[PDB]
Amino acid sequence: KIHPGVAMTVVRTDEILSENILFSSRASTSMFIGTPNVSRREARVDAVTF
Amino acid sequence: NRGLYNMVNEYSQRLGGHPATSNTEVQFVVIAGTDVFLEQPCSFLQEAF
């Protein structure tokens, strides 16, 4: 427990779970909504996956 | 150790973490349950203040 001939500066990172607040102004972004088209992916032998 | 909500129901339902008795001159171990109402945080979180 003697001191060595050198020192150290211990850096670490600490994660903090926050509860954010998002503001956004009116008419900031114009967006086009598409069409919800349905499909068939896989005809597995007992269940078909849409 | 197993489960967390079932630990809460184990805490609330019958609550036998082997507590001591009451209204005796020296504390014994209680055997007859749900007659004296107890509550044991030490039997839940295993520490001491």
Partner: protein, 49 residues
């Protein structure tokens, strides 16, 4: 999505050494040691709890 995890960075030195004209801006600390011949060897950190 809003409950995000910001992570900061903390840093602290361990075992530094003051220059030789030492001093103290306190009153109620008395250490049984020769004050001009003491240096740290460990650093004490407070935990999350």
């Amino acid at each position: 999505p809003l409950n995000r995890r910001m992570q900061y960075s903390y840093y602290f030195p361990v075992g530094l050494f003051m220059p030789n004209p030492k001093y103290t801006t306190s009153a109620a600390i008395k250490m049984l040691d020769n004050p001009t011949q003491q240096l740290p060897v460990e650093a004490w950190i407070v935990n999350k709890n």
